[PDB]
């Protein structure tokens, strides 16, 4: 995941404030920050005066300081605030545009942008054009992955996929195949897929007539809530209107026909930020249609099905004869070796199975779950909540094809005496952060938690 | 005032509400920055005080010895507070009381020796560890003295 | 982690007048109402779209405000619907006021309010088995005079406490009125892991609210903000009325009695006692 | 604050020596060799290191799988 | 079968119980071997 | 079609204090295969549940646990008021496996010995979870039963899948003759509810007995943290309670003061008692066609009332089970919840 939040902080500060002028964008980005930062920001928003950092330290206690650093580093990186070495101290305060926009949003501000929606006869039916948006999303997914017939006419969308290198397909020969990007597209279920596509449209649509402030205004206004009336008609910039038409083509806009009307708020824009339920001629009833198969016997038992879904399953398992409720497929080392040929790591698939194919594995994941977390301290043996056997077999296939070991962290030095090194090693063993250590070299390559805690203890 | 003025004020408020109003912008925010500050002061004061609740002795051998002394004095006082309540075995109570006074003096000498040898900080820790039991036995002694004076005088 | 903050605002027009009587009449409950609306919106925004609920306690009963029982049969705009609906309901309730309303001043239905709110929490939690709701309710009371401590509600309050603890539902309380520490409420917040706030009258609470009435959803690594000690030296003697320390509690009656036994038939259950037992007590 | 970042590699010393050989063949991208069991490398070229490792192991073993 | 005076006089039983717990024998001796308590009442607590 | 208790006819007295001595059964019989793991494992699991429950609802009582292995009764938890000790003891047992024959007589005698210190106002009890179909006694049994009933010791037993004559005699004997206490089970859920109904205090129609005022005092929490110091376990504990009279620290409990030996409680225990003394009238199920009341809930706001004329559906019933004294409706969920968890009737509180 490119972690669009990282792209957000990527952009410079002045354009960040340019975006913060739009209160709805302020709210939407408030939705994204880690909870610690959320709470701290909500504290600061009202008392119109900077605050010393010492208070914001003493606010948090023990065994939870890691999140303090997470929040402060994130917020500084995206520069929502302005640290102030006023008297040599730290006089924190938000980018005041952010503060005022947010406060306006909380109590009836002047955000005509966020208020761009119009209330009228929302003749849009729940299934009404919702099925059409779902069908468009399925069509583009199939065309990108490659179906027997790809009716994907998104010439702009195809150009974005190709130039963006969305999938390892020979666009010169017209191929739309799964690359590392294609593997990720197979991985990111909904939010991941929509996010990758939005980032691709951003990167491709970045040359001329961008108006990035208007771009994000339109995007978040779409994700915020149903603008409905007068959206497409009134509430859009010129380039904003063009981007809206393009998104509506991309499915992310459920604009009605007649090419001129209010905004058509498809559920997809909601899906962009919701991180919630995923379900979308005139028939389609399934809260658990996807009937995948995955047990301890490493077999594929399917009753429920979805053609693109089962094709995704086939992307790492053989197909011989499609059946009524089943499809001939058995997951083996060869089955995942198919994706290993694409170099697909046995990592995304883990959480994928934990999440996807569950419409047919609800009872399976419940019996594996068994609520064996509160019962874990008492009964020390887990009831295969997340199947470890399958994980071990997958790791074995991955190991069979790999043979290389790597570690994260950074090399450390200036352990002048053996006493500091030994005490830090003991503390790390207490906290389980030392990958490896040696007093002879006074060096190691681990996470920064031990150094952080020692420095905090020393300075304060 | 009740009844009349009650309904009066009630209606006044009802109106004020109905009188558009409810300016959540005007909702205090904090109004007086000073008032705000004062509220924060109160709250940080309380946070500090309740935080003072951090939910390890030095001389392990003296610690165990003091623990033995505490157990001893505890059971001794146990027997008194049984007997001093219950009742005709007065002489048994007398023996218990004399022994308890002896134990109190013993612990006093113990504290003296601790202050002499372990110094002050360790002696301070010992005194802290033994404060509750010491207070209880002292109170028992005082209560017996009061009861004995009452019976005698 | 969604939370169901179910405020319980009591509004006694008697106590509303007392609030006007207290200090000056420099502003009716309107201040409290507006601050409550804002705080409610704040919580409604904070989490991932977690419901709320509000109940009242007028002089002759209680009635819901927000969930808006079947009647026909801006900013995110759901804030809009919640707030406008609440205010319409509350104005309707204020229409429900007259002399016959002035009549039944004998009681104060706060206990009914808390109990019903807890029932509501149970309803919502039970229906929403998926995505378990870390719920927790609130209490706003206009502290008035004319009764130093009404006690005829003592038991149902504690039953509320025990229900809360079993249901794992912290219950925070904000008393606005005279410097009379609402003992039962104080024990309620302290026991059920809550927070007590005895504000002065006319300050715009919104700061107090958003500070110390927003940290109870599903956090609890954070020091609560309770006032001075919460002594559990409990109820005064039923016969006497002076707070007891070394109690003297009868029997199956369970009433707590002072050092003054009437010698027979503890004055809450007709149970004559063993005069031998009476003498045994008198053996001191 | 001293934190020397890189691609830390830890394995058996024989595989470490083989990795050093390969790395020298591909112009010594290994930043440091912390000990007989740890290596500090630049993550830029570790991927092609693994690629060439796969190539040479396929060349040698060939997986008869008889 | 079991009586207060009976357990009081069950000296062999009492010494067996002394053998029962190190903590027990320790506290007992330091209440006794320290010129402290007659065992009678000491058990009168522990009946 | 209803399954309700008609009326409660001892809503005047219960044993509020208790000293219940649960006695399990760990003997070769309990190793048969009728309950899912066995008899024994399921038994001990439910025993843990019952321990938690009972020490909740009767938070002022004590309890002791007794097994019956190899014809011997080996006490596995002294009679004590701290649930955690008993919980741990049961944990330990559950990993150990039964043997020998159940010696009901020995267990009975051990109990009768065990409950002697319990004072007169406290009430005694035993709860035999008898699993087998035999005993093995080293003495006369009717001798023991007579001694028991002489010592005013009610006994309730929960046989497994049979009825044993002697046990029936035992229950009928100690409980003042009135036989209702030998309930035996026919299903696991029946077993859960068996323990549940064992939790509550036990009235039948109490003979006029001595009723006695009991001295006790309440503690006040402590403040300091570093001054950690304890007088009931002789440790350092960051802060606890003070006996109002003995005036010595005591680690958190409703326990008895270990210095001056008087009972300690806060009140909430007394509140639980109050809840048990005077319960509510069982909520009535309103007539299907004669109700004509509000179409909602009252405590909650449910939309489950009727359907208005639907051949058989409306002919079924009208979910309006409504309490008497307040005469307000309540949906089934609300009534179940009120009568199970919180006993303040919503409407009946408000008037
Ligand atoms: Zn203790
Ligand atoms: Zn005491
Ligand atoms: Zn209901
Ligand atoms: Zn009722």
Residue numbers in the entry:
A (entry chain 2): 7 to 286, 328 to 507
B (entry chain 1): 465 to 519, 537 to 567, 573 to 639
C (entry chain 4): 22 to 94, 113 to 323
D (entry chain 5): 2 to 67
E (entry chain 1): 168 to 214
F (entry chain 6): 107 to 457
What does the paper say about this structure?
The versatile nucleotide excision repair (NER) pathway initiates as the XPC–RAD23B–CETN2 complex first recognizes DNA lesions from the genomic DNA and recruits the general transcription factor complex, TFIIH, for subsequent lesion verification. Here, we present a cryo-EM structure of an NER initiation complex containing Rad4–Rad23-Rad33 (yeast homologue of XPC–RAD23B–CETN2) and 7-subunit coreTFIIH assembled on a carcinogen-DNA adduct lesion at 3.9–9.2 Å resolution. Altogether, our study illustrates how the Rad4–Rad23–Rad33 (XPC–RAD23B–CETN2) complex recruits TFIIH to damaged DNA in 3D structural models and provides the groundwork to visualize how the NER initiation is carried out in multiple, coordinated yet distinct steps.
Compared with Map 1 that resolved TFIIH at high resolution and yet had a poor density for Rad4–Rad23–Rad33, Map 2 clearly showed the elongated density for the Rad4–Rad33 complex bound to DNA at 9.2 Å resolution. The previous NMR model of the Tfb1 PH domain (residues 1–114) bound to an N-terminal segment of Rad4 preceding TGD (N-Rad4; residues 90–104)61 was placed into the density, guided by with 9 and 6 cross-links formed with BSD1 and BSD2 of Tfb1, respectively. On the other hand, the BHD2-3 (residues 489–632 of Rad4) bound to a segment of DNA at the lesion (at positions –1 to +1) were located near Ssl2. A ~30 bp stretch of DNA could be mapped along with the protein complex in two distinct segments with respect to the lesion: the dsDNA at the 5' side of the DNA lesion was bound to Ssl2, similarly as observed in the transcription initiation complex, while the duplex at the 3' side of the lesion was bound to the TGD-BHD1 domains of Rad4 near Tfb1 of TFIIH. In between, the DNA was locally (~3 bp) unwound at the lesion, as required for the simultaneous binding with Ssl2 and Rad4. In sum, our model shows that Rad4 binds TFIIH at two points of contact, straddling between the two ends of the horseshoe-shaped TFIIH: N-Rad4 (residues 90–104) contacts with the PH domain of Tfb1, and C-Rad4 (residues 648–664) with the C-terminal helix of C-Ssl2 through Rad33. The DNA in our TFIIH/Rad4–23–33/DNA structure shows that the unwinding is extended (positions from –3 to +1) compared to that in Rad4–Rad23/DNA (positions from 0 to +1).
